[PDB]
Amino acid sequence: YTDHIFDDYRLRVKALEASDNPFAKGIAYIAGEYVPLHEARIPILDQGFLHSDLTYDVPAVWNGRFFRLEDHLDRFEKSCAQLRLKSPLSREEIRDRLVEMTVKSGIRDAYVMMIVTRGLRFVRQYAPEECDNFCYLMVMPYLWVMDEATQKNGGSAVITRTVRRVPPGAIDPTVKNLQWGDFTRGLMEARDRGAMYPILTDGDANLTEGSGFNVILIKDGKLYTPRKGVLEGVTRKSVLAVAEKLGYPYTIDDVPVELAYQCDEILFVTTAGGVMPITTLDGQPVGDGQVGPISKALWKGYWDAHADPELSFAVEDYRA
Amino acid sequence: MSYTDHIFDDYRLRVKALEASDNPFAKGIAYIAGEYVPLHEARIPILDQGFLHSDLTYDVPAVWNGRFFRLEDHLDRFEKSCAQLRLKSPLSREEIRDRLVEMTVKSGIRDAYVMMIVTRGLRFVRQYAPEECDNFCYLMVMPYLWVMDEATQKNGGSAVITRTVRRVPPGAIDPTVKNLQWGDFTRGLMEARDRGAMYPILTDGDANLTEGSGFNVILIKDGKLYTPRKGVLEGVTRKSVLAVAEKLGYPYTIDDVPVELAYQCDEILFVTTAGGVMPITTLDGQPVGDGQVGPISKALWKGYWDAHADPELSFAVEDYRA
Ligand SMILES: Cc1ncc(COP(=O)(O)O)c(C=O)c1O
Ligand SMILES: Cc1ncc(COP(=O)(O)O)c(C=O)c1O
Ligand SMILES: [Cl-]
């Protein structure tokens, strides 16, 4: 079922790797300058580094079409407000520059980043309103949390037992952030236990999310995905809209840990890879150990949606 | 006659001298990829996982009147922190020490805030085993920073026990491993400002006190010191103040500190490398005890700073040799 998109994608990557464009390996916007991604540098005094004082968002370009960029911009502006950050670049400026950098790079399948940091001033010495916040933009070749090869059979995960999710009353998980202390411990625990990915609990016997992805349990034809303690993922939104069209019931609510061990299918969903089936959990098969039919149908709907003119636009039909 | 003059008179003179210096490193110096760079020109690659996933640990010793204080304790904790996160410094312990002293002498700074950082580097631990990652080391020496300045120490600072945020629990992020994932502390600083206070004190969300944004907390009641054990960094400043407390005959306990005790204590100290002993005289808009900097705070303050000359716990940067 992967050939549906990956045959065409592999052709586009071949063309990009053959390109002599100095931005084909990626492009960064830093202080009004476009720089090749691997030469791009930020000041070490940026509080985005010295206190991870930032928020970010990651839309994708697929076959030269941005997917749900307005949803990512909406969530980014919301995230900025929650942390009392104000982007020096307008929402409309960010959109214009992200499209320009995509065209300028020639990258047709892109992992895109918009970052706002506190700047050089910290919020102990200064009110947030007295801080001049920084904006960084990056466009790079599309990244896969789960690659084609792994998606064909599904990946492996564990419910972490050495680490639990940062609670929202400490750090708000609806505000996309790079304070991955728990997720990083999770990835190490997964490798220790011979699995690719962690699923973190809330420390109260419910599932939350993983290292850069939401979790969807499928049982008896119904989708179950955590409400609290997680990022409100754009991939999750897309997959649930596809589920609605196909007549699959879903609920965004508490997901008790027990349900992970009794379900038929598990999906991980994220911008960086899309729909990512999981067929091993804690060393045991998920259901029959096969990529399930509902996973396949949602995978197809998700990718088909990247041509939907209501949800996407082509990078050349765009005008500032 | 103010008790703060004991150190600030001499320090205000030394800064004046430094602000007159033409040395291009007098504003600070960074080690980046085997090069010394002026601090305000120093840059790191945007793809450093120290940035893209705050995948790092750090430590902060200080230089005072040209003497490093307890640098070996900071190096000990840094190596422990690196091991916990499966980071290996590309610079040995001995190289970090040599370079930190070199950068201090080269800068001419007599009162410095020092920073040793190790990040994951350009590879992340999803695609790669941690042993496959070539980790980066960054060093910085800059003019000494004050979480609480001279003016505030004279009458004491203001704090609140946070009610809009709690501390990241140890089973999410290990607080004994010094890290820059300040999501909770940053919320705390914003809440403090909203409530007309300088500093936050975060609870563990289970009715105990933890630490604040870059400092440990010590309560003092009926001559006894109480400081949280769990949910906090094991501060070198806290260690020093407790040694000064043991030597002066003040009993102390490192254990759970229930929130209630904050409202019933006689004195409150915040302790950190970036400011030292920092008395707190207002809590949730009300006086701490009699609203004055207390006698035990002053005694511990004096002992802490006096110990920056002790030859067993400090060394002069000029007398050091690689
Ligand atoms: C913690 C976390 N959860 C979930 C996601 C996926 O959400 P989205 O589909 O909006 O990328 C990400 C994104 O990388 C993430 O960092
Ligand atoms: C969270 C936290 N606790 C405690 C401290 C104090 O540790 P030390 O006294 O060793 O500097 C700091 C210093 O920055 C800190 O960030
Ligand atoms: Cl719910």
XYZ file of C-alpha atoms and ligand atoms in Angstrom:
675
model
C 0.000 0.000 0.000
C 3.109 2.358 0.454
C 3.829 2.392 -3.378
C 0.710 4.684 -3.665
C 2.963 7.712 -2.658
C 6.553 6.454 -2.140
C 7.328 5.505 -5.813
C 6.698 9.166 -6.878
C 8.459 10.490 -3.706
C 11.687 8.462 -4.390
C 11.808 9.998 -7.964
C 11.556 13.558 -6.473
C 14.365 12.798 -3.905
C 16.649 11.481 -6.723
C 16.120 14.837 -8.567
C 16.824 16.867 -5.350
C 20.082 14.891 -4.618
C 21.208 15.572 -8.256
C 20.523 19.381 -7.809
C 23.528 21.823 -7.702
C 21.258 24.408 -5.916
C 23.238 25.411 -2.764
C 19.852 25.418 -0.818
C 18.820 21.868 -1.948
C 20.115 20.480 1.429
C 17.933 23.119 3.189
C 17.599 26.907 3.754
C 17.325 28.992 6.957
C 16.029 32.573 7.433
C 18.293 34.177 10.126
C 18.263 37.973 10.869
C 16.919 38.931 7.361
C 19.458 36.615 5.553
C 18.842 33.274 3.748
C 21.701 30.811 4.556
C 22.312 27.151 3.582
C 20.896 25.021 6.439
C 24.231 23.323 7.346
C 26.020 26.763 7.607
C 23.113 28.386 9.623
C 24.186 29.592 13.126
C 22.371 31.410 16.030
C 23.925 33.432 18.884
C 24.795 31.220 21.897
C 23.189 34.003 24.083
C 19.764 33.330 22.449
C 17.474 32.397 25.388
C 15.968 29.856 22.937
C 19.235 28.008 23.798
C 20.162 29.228 27.344
C 16.637 28.413 28.791
C 14.850 26.619 25.854
C 12.599 29.725 25.977
C 10.762 29.242 22.672
C 7.844 27.734 20.807
C 7.780 26.306 17.278
C 5.564 24.625 14.683
C 6.246 22.251 11.757
C 4.095 22.133 8.624
C 5.139 19.999 5.618
C 5.359 20.421 1.820
C 4.419 17.306 -0.199
C 4.878 17.115 -4.013
C 5.193 20.978 -3.954
C 1.910 21.449 -1.956
C 1.862 22.900 1.591
C -0.575 20.822 3.729
C -2.824 22.623 6.290
C -0.299 25.507 6.658
C -3.119 27.791 8.032
C -3.787 25.240 10.863
C -0.033 25.236 11.780
C 0.089 29.075 11.666
C -3.084 29.184 13.874
C -1.503 26.831 16.483
C 1.855 28.690 16.302
C 0.221 32.105 17.012
C -1.716 30.498 19.906
C 1.549 28.945 21.276
C 3.353 32.331 20.995
C 0.501 34.054 22.973
C 0.567 31.401 25.758
C 4.323 32.042 26.331
C 3.931 35.875 25.923
C 6.074 35.746 22.748
C 5.388 38.135 19.840
C 6.948 37.108 16.475
C 8.936 39.988 14.891
C 7.466 38.576 11.600
C 3.707 38.834 10.839
C 1.735 35.576 10.272
C 1.477 36.702 6.588
C 5.279 37.504 6.522
C 6.083 33.948 7.825
C 3.801 32.395 5.152
C 5.368 34.535 2.327
C 8.951 33.716 3.426
C 8.277 29.952 3.999
C 6.874 29.685 0.401
C 9.751 31.793 -1.036
C 12.368 29.572 0.750
C 10.637 26.384 -0.587
C 10.678 27.705 -4.232
C 14.274 29.025 -3.783
C 15.426 25.581 -2.420
C 13.599 23.530 -5.130
C 12.664 21.079 -2.286
C 9.274 19.502 -3.289
C 8.940 17.333 -0.095
C 9.914 19.463 2.921
C 10.055 19.457 6.720
C 9.382 23.117 7.627
C 10.137 24.854 10.969
C 8.982 28.233 12.364
C 10.660 29.104 15.717
C 10.186 32.134 18.019
C 12.601 32.554 20.961
C 12.628 35.080 23.838
C 15.746 36.725 22.247
C 18.829 37.960 24.200
C 16.772 39.080 27.277
C 15.311 36.699 29.932
C 12.037 37.184 31.899
C 13.664 37.376 35.404
C 15.429 40.735 34.656
C 12.792 42.008 32.104
C 9.003 41.819 31.629
C 8.108 39.646 28.569
C 6.827 42.922 26.899
C 10.410 44.441 27.176
C 11.952 41.388 25.330
C 12.594 41.675 21.523
C 11.767 38.099 20.421
C 13.630 36.371 17.518
C 12.148 34.406 14.595
C 13.996 31.580 12.745
C 12.551 29.787 9.680
C 13.973 26.577 8.134
C 13.008 24.481 5.084
C 14.738 21.090 4.771
C 14.113 17.772 2.959
C 11.129 15.850 4.446
C 12.070 13.725 7.528
C 10.535 10.340 8.472
C 10.016 9.333 12.128
C 9.005 6.012 10.470
C 10.404 5.403 6.912
C 8.748 3.522 3.994
C 10.548 0.213 4.844
C 9.226 0.264 8.471
C 5.677 1.469 7.560
C 5.202 -1.637 5.325
C 5.355 -3.982 8.391
C 4.841 -1.431 11.215
C 7.265 -0.352 13.963
C 7.872 -1.375 17.597
C 7.020 0.642 20.765
C 6.952 0.352 24.558
C 4.786 1.985 27.235
C 7.619 3.686 29.179
C 8.084 2.448 32.768
C 11.285 4.456 33.668
C 9.788 7.866 32.674
C 6.313 9.596 32.645
C 5.032 12.619 30.603
C 5.722 16.175 31.924
C 2.334 17.174 33.418
C 0.510 20.160 31.852
C 0.670 22.068 35.201
C 4.494 22.065 34.821
C 4.774 22.611 30.996
C 1.675 23.018 28.759
C 1.885 20.228 26.114
C -0.648 22.076 23.851
C 2.151 24.688 23.410
C 4.597 22.980 20.997
C 8.039 23.054 22.705
C 11.537 21.522 22.485
C 11.879 20.656 26.230
C 12.076 16.919 25.375
C 13.709 15.753 28.673
C 10.947 13.105 29.124
C 10.711 12.050 25.405
C 14.561 11.772 25.217
C 14.547 9.444 28.297
C 11.703 7.545 26.557
C 13.710 7.015 23.309
C 16.665 5.685 25.367
C 14.355 3.339 27.361
C 12.802 2.102 24.063
C 16.302 1.278 22.671
C 17.242 -0.401 26.026
C 14.120 -2.643 25.604
C 14.724 -3.347 21.850
C 11.948 -1.039 20.553
C 12.012 1.988 18.185
C 9.548 4.329 19.989
C 8.276 5.280 23.452
C 4.649 5.848 24.486
C 4.674 7.845 27.770
C 1.865 7.513 30.378
C 0.545 10.563 32.319
C 1.724 8.841 35.550
C -2.013 8.236 36.343
C -2.556 5.043 34.232
C -3.534 6.882 30.971
C -1.645 7.111 27.632
C -0.381 10.503 26.431
C 1.863 10.811 23.352
C 5.332 9.765 22.118
C 8.571 11.528 21.033
C 7.081 13.848 18.365
C 3.781 12.070 17.626
C 0.199 11.474 18.837
C -1.156 7.928 19.494
C -4.447 6.461 18.152
C -5.695 3.053 19.414
C -8.103 1.125 17.128
C -10.431 -1.542 18.567
C -13.662 -3.113 17.184
C -13.737 -0.444 14.418
C -13.415 2.612 16.761
C -10.495 5.076 17.148
C -9.362 6.159 20.668
C -6.808 8.986 21.216
C -5.815 10.940 24.377
C -7.326 14.411 24.955
C -5.159 15.721 27.834
C -1.369 15.784 28.296
C -0.666 15.920 24.511
C -0.157 18.300 21.576
C -3.393 18.785 19.574
C -1.745 17.340 16.441
C -2.608 18.532 12.906
C -1.932 14.942 11.708
C -4.403 13.694 14.370
C -6.963 16.305 13.172
C -6.469 15.139 9.505
C -6.679 11.371 10.359
C -9.872 11.892 12.418
C -11.472 13.927 9.547
C -10.588 10.996 7.181
C -12.066 8.560 9.762
C -15.326 10.643 9.821
C -15.609 10.472 5.962
C -15.035 6.654 6.037
C -17.615 6.066 8.850
C -15.060 5.085 11.570
C -16.296 6.324 15.004
C -13.661 8.115 17.113
C -13.338 9.702 20.577
C -10.761 12.213 21.923
C -10.822 11.331 25.648
C -8.879 9.556 28.435
C -7.169 6.405 27.060
C -6.446 4.002 29.954
C -3.136 2.086 29.608
C -5.064 -1.254 29.652
C -6.637 -0.436 26.237
C -3.126 -0.441 24.579
C -2.822 -4.205 25.444
C -6.366 -5.100 24.191
C -6.575 -3.046 20.930
C -6.511 -4.347 17.298
C -4.255 -1.647 15.714
C -1.987 1.224 16.870
C -1.182 4.344 14.777
C 1.418 6.975 15.586
C 0.627 10.221 13.692
C 2.891 13.239 13.070
C 3.767 15.796 10.357
C 7.232 14.124 9.991
C 6.091 10.776 8.493
C 2.273 10.994 8.467
C 0.441 7.756 9.442
C 2.873 5.297 11.106
C 1.522 1.823 12.059
C 2.859 0.052 15.197
C 2.668 -3.770 15.171
C 4.876 -4.646 18.217
C 4.161 -3.341 21.791
C 6.345 -4.323 24.814
C 7.839 -7.193 22.721
C 4.400 -8.682 21.761
C 2.227 -8.477 18.630
C -0.422 -5.707 18.470
C -3.496 -7.808 17.552
C -2.354 -10.294 14.810
C 1.027 -8.436 14.412
C -0.027 -7.173 10.909
C -0.693 -3.632 9.654
C -4.496 -3.589 10.019
C -7.169 -2.627 7.452
C -8.264 0.579 9.283
C -4.591 1.751 9.497
C -4.254 1.144 5.692
C -7.533 3.003 4.885
C -6.610 6.018 7.120
C -3.049 6.043 5.629
C -4.576 6.221 2.085
C -7.150 8.942 3.059
C -4.459 11.041 4.804
C -2.135 11.073 1.765
C -5.030 11.496 -0.756
C -5.918 14.663 1.292
C -2.541 16.303 0.283
C -4.128 17.066 -3.182
C -7.400 18.481 -1.640
C -7.472 22.189 -2.712
C -9.400 23.061 0.528
C -6.454 21.712 2.664
C -3.402 22.451 0.435
C -1.965 24.901 -2.146
C 0.799 24.445 -4.753
C 3.972 26.517 -4.046
C 4.022 28.109 -7.581
C 0.229 29.155 -7.547
C 0.980 31.166 -4.332
C 1.317 35.000 -4.554
C 2.545 37.369 -1.833
C 25.750 50.414 58.521
C 24.706 47.706 55.952
C 25.934 44.027 56.235
C 26.215 43.781 52.369
C 29.134 46.349 52.270
C 31.401 43.464 53.592
C 31.861 42.246 49.914
C 30.050 44.814 47.670
C 32.425 47.770 48.477
C 35.437 45.809 47.067
C 33.370 44.273 44.216
C 31.993 47.679 43.038
C 35.651 48.840 42.732
C 36.737 45.740 40.725
C 33.827 46.115 38.240
C 34.648 49.840 37.668
C 38.230 48.712 36.810
C 36.845 46.014 34.405
C 34.399 48.459 32.661
C 37.487 50.706 31.962
C 39.401 47.702 30.384
C 39.912 47.714 26.538
C 40.472 43.866 26.517
C 38.202 42.510 23.698
C 37.242 39.540 26.036
C 36.327 41.780 29.044
C 32.590 41.426 28.117
C 33.031 37.612 28.069
C 34.709 34.801 26.102
C 33.326 31.572 24.606
C 35.095 28.349 23.502
C 33.363 27.115 20.274
C 34.994 24.348 18.107
C 38.587 24.898 19.434
C 38.338 28.720 18.946
C 38.007 31.535 21.520
C 35.346 34.085 20.424
C 34.050 37.280 22.092
C 30.877 36.222 23.992
C 28.526 38.600 22.087
C 29.864 37.342 18.668
C 29.777 33.610 19.733
C 27.371 31.497 17.599
C 26.352 27.779 17.539
C 24.928 25.749 14.628
C 21.094 25.931 14.516
C 21.039 22.091 13.996
C 22.807 21.521 17.373
C 20.407 19.179 19.264
C 21.316 21.326 22.317
C 18.896 23.736 20.512
C 16.492 21.486 18.502
C 15.636 19.280 21.582
C 17.417 21.059 24.532
C 19.477 17.816 24.588
C 22.274 18.929 26.948
C 23.468 19.339 30.515
C 25.511 22.196 31.985
C 27.108 23.469 35.184
C 27.987 26.952 36.519
C 30.920 27.622 38.852
C 31.915 31.221 39.740
C 35.160 33.233 40.086
C 35.184 35.780 42.959
C 38.022 38.338 43.475
C 40.095 36.159 41.033
C 39.457 32.868 42.969
C 37.406 29.938 41.570
C 35.071 28.584 44.315
C 34.458 24.799 44.633
C 35.260 24.261 40.908
C 35.981 20.533 41.659
C 32.405 20.102 43.100
C 30.925 21.653 39.890
C 33.157 19.442 37.675
C 32.112 16.367 39.785
C 28.386 17.180 39.296
C 28.897 18.000 35.577
C 30.545 14.593 34.880
C 27.700 12.869 36.837
C 25.067 14.876 34.821
C 26.805 13.950 31.509
C 26.792 10.216 32.482
C 23.054 10.280 33.452
C 22.163 11.627 29.955
C 24.702 9.268 28.218
C 26.716 12.312 27.049
C 30.531 12.154 26.777
C 32.350 15.538 26.746
C 34.807 15.743 23.795
C 37.004 17.672 26.335
C 38.361 15.752 29.367
C 37.693 17.056 32.910
C 41.368 18.273 32.967
C 40.992 20.087 29.581
C 37.749 21.841 30.727
C 39.479 23.050 33.936
C 42.621 24.261 32.028
C 40.520 26.134 29.418
C 38.097 27.658 32.007
C 41.112 29.112 33.937
C 42.838 30.213 30.670
C 39.630 32.007 29.492
C 39.317 33.770 32.912
C 42.974 35.038 32.813
C 42.638 35.954 29.075
C 39.383 37.929 29.846
C 40.806 39.725 32.935
C 37.408 39.274 34.757
C 37.823 39.001 38.599
C 34.110 38.253 39.336
C 32.870 35.782 36.729
C 29.787 33.648 35.867
C 31.266 30.514 34.236
C 29.394 27.991 32.061
C 30.413 24.472 30.865
C 27.812 22.940 28.485
C 27.753 19.568 26.660
C 25.096 18.947 23.951
C 24.157 15.822 21.939
C 25.675 17.432 18.778
C 24.111 17.182 15.269
C 22.607 13.637 15.633
C 19.463 12.819 17.704
C 18.896 9.620 19.772
C 15.763 8.461 17.809
C 17.724 7.486 14.613
C 21.069 6.837 16.471
C 22.180 5.048 19.655
C 23.642 7.658 22.085
C 27.160 6.050 21.643
C 26.985 6.909 17.831
C 26.545 10.695 18.659
C 29.670 13.009 18.666
C 28.740 15.412 21.515
C 29.737 19.137 21.572
C 31.334 21.108 24.443
C 30.793 24.889 24.852
C 32.580 26.977 27.522
C 31.718 30.606 28.483
C 33.251 33.076 30.982
C 31.285 36.331 31.525
C 30.942 39.055 34.202
C 29.297 37.727 37.432
C 25.440 37.774 37.248
C 23.140 38.507 40.244
C 19.762 36.745 40.628
C 19.493 39.175 43.615
C 21.553 42.434 43.360
C 23.213 44.462 46.185
C 20.237 46.873 46.586
C 17.738 43.968 47.050
C 19.964 41.941 49.435
C 20.068 44.885 51.947
C 16.312 44.620 52.784
C 15.622 41.182 51.175
C 13.592 40.180 48.102
C 9.968 39.173 47.454
C 8.651 35.739 46.377
C 5.417 33.816 45.849
C 4.663 30.089 46.199
C 3.428 29.419 42.644
C -0.237 28.427 42.233
C -0.448 28.499 38.355
C 2.520 26.072 37.879
C 4.251 23.174 39.763
C 7.760 21.683 39.389
C 8.484 19.128 36.619
C 8.498 15.829 38.582
C 11.711 13.740 38.733
C 10.057 10.833 36.829
C 9.621 13.203 33.837
C 12.975 15.081 34.011
C 15.636 14.310 36.675
C 16.169 17.635 38.527
C 19.553 16.418 39.967
C 20.798 16.584 36.315
C 21.215 20.341 35.740
C 19.261 21.208 32.545
C 17.933 24.271 30.653
C 14.365 22.919 30.153
C 12.924 25.826 32.195
C 9.255 25.578 30.997
C 8.035 25.452 34.644
C 10.530 28.041 36.048
C 9.709 30.446 33.156
C 5.945 30.134 33.939
C 6.939 30.748 37.612
C 8.850 33.989 36.788
C 5.847 35.267 34.782
C 3.454 34.364 37.672
C 5.752 36.151 40.178
C 5.690 39.341 38.025
C 1.858 39.041 37.631
C 1.542 38.898 41.482
C 3.972 41.841 42.089
C 6.890 39.644 43.312
C 10.497 39.108 42.097
C 10.849 35.280 42.403
C 8.810 32.048 42.298
C 8.983 29.106 44.723
C 7.514 26.032 42.944
C 5.730 23.212 44.835
C 6.006 19.519 43.818
C 2.191 19.538 43.285
C 1.938 17.310 46.432
C 1.998 20.156 49.042
C 5.849 20.262 49.438
C 8.298 23.043 48.405
C 10.912 22.264 45.680
C 13.197 25.096 44.362
C 12.750 28.214 42.295
C 14.007 29.515 38.953
C 17.761 28.808 39.337
C 18.102 28.573 43.152
C 17.508 26.258 46.120
C 15.270 27.285 49.065
C 16.158 27.113 52.786
C 13.580 27.882 55.528
C 14.861 28.898 58.999
C 12.661 28.438 62.106
C 13.712 28.452 65.815
C 17.391 28.326 64.752
C 17.005 25.226 62.466
C 17.461 25.124 58.649
C 14.973 23.119 56.492
C 15.597 22.513 52.747
C 13.900 20.115 50.278
C 15.682 16.844 49.422
C 13.717 15.619 46.350
C 12.564 17.457 43.207
C 15.602 19.826 43.268
C 19.174 20.299 42.056
C 21.686 19.398 44.810
C 23.170 22.920 44.822
C 26.878 23.644 45.540
C 25.650 26.916 47.145
C 23.273 24.840 49.348
C 26.213 22.514 50.239
C 28.391 25.560 51.175
C 25.635 27.236 53.295
C 24.925 23.933 55.137
C 28.702 23.490 55.856
C 28.720 27.133 57.176
C 25.549 26.181 59.189
C 27.111 22.944 60.636
C 30.317 24.880 61.628
C 28.220 27.671 63.323
C 26.162 25.111 65.326
C 22.891 25.661 63.399
C 21.078 22.289 62.965
C 19.798 21.535 59.441
C 17.674 18.871 57.711
C 17.559 17.868 54.006
C 14.041 16.340 53.746
C 10.430 17.075 52.673
C 9.502 20.721 53.453
C 5.687 20.969 53.609
C 4.301 24.202 52.070
C 2.740 25.192 55.456
C 6.240 25.682 56.974
C 6.939 28.571 54.478
C 4.176 30.609 56.239
C 5.400 29.776 59.816
C 9.218 30.237 59.432
C 11.416 33.104 60.794
C 13.745 33.599 57.753
C 13.938 32.444 54.086
C 17.151 32.118 52.001
C 17.432 31.537 48.270
C 20.889 30.112 47.417
C 22.574 29.886 43.984
C 26.021 30.325 42.374
C 24.717 33.469 40.551
C 24.188 35.714 43.632
C 25.195 33.539 46.617
C 22.992 33.931 49.734
C 19.797 35.862 48.874
C 17.443 36.660 51.798
C 13.652 36.807 51.179
C 11.614 39.077 53.491
C 8.237 39.148 51.625
C 6.214 35.967 50.742
C 2.784 36.115 48.989
C 2.712 39.896 49.750
C 3.250 39.422 53.551
C 6.309 39.769 55.801
C 8.541 36.746 56.495
C 8.749 36.793 60.327
C 9.436 40.458 61.359
C 9.926 41.521 57.657
C 13.688 42.155 58.286
C 16.760 40.262 57.045
C 17.280 37.925 60.023
C 20.438 37.254 62.070
C 20.951 33.634 60.841
C 20.644 34.779 57.164
C 23.348 37.443 57.837
C 25.663 34.912 59.632
C 25.337 32.344 56.771
C 25.761 35.130 54.136
C 29.021 36.229 55.866
C 30.383 32.653 56.291
C 29.560 31.761 52.645
C 31.475 34.772 51.225
C 34.342 34.467 53.806
C 34.779 30.848 52.520
C 35.630 32.186 48.962
C 39.195 32.845 50.336
C 39.601 29.378 52.099
C 42.560 27.608 50.310
C 40.902 24.096 50.485
C 37.656 25.278 48.705
C 39.165 27.893 46.249
C 42.279 28.748 44.144
C 43.543 32.036 42.611
C 43.468 31.870 38.733
C 46.997 33.427 38.512
C 48.575 30.710 40.732
C 46.966 27.908 38.655
C 49.153 26.166 36.009
C 47.992 23.549 33.393
C 5.171 16.080 21.294
C 4.578 16.009 19.930
N 3.408 15.394 19.784
C 2.842 15.308 18.567
C 3.407 15.832 17.443
C 2.735 15.679 16.113
O 1.694 16.672 15.883
P 1.525 17.263 14.365
O 0.700 16.245 13.602
O 0.802 18.601 14.536
O 2.939 17.424 13.832
C 4.641 16.473 17.556
C 5.259 17.053 16.358
O 6.382 16.868 15.968
C 5.239 16.570 18.828
O 6.430 17.181 19.030
C 17.055 24.744 39.356
C 18.281 25.169 40.093
N 18.422 24.785 41.357
C 19.505 25.174 42.052
C 20.491 25.958 41.523
C 21.661 26.322 42.383
O 22.706 25.322 42.205
P 24.127 25.836 42.637
O 23.959 26.442 44.037
O 24.970 24.592 42.608
O 24.492 26.873 41.568
C 20.376 26.385 40.192
C 21.376 27.238 39.534
O 21.252 27.767 38.428
C 19.245 25.969 39.471
O 19.047 26.335 38.186
Cl -11.019 13.433 28.835
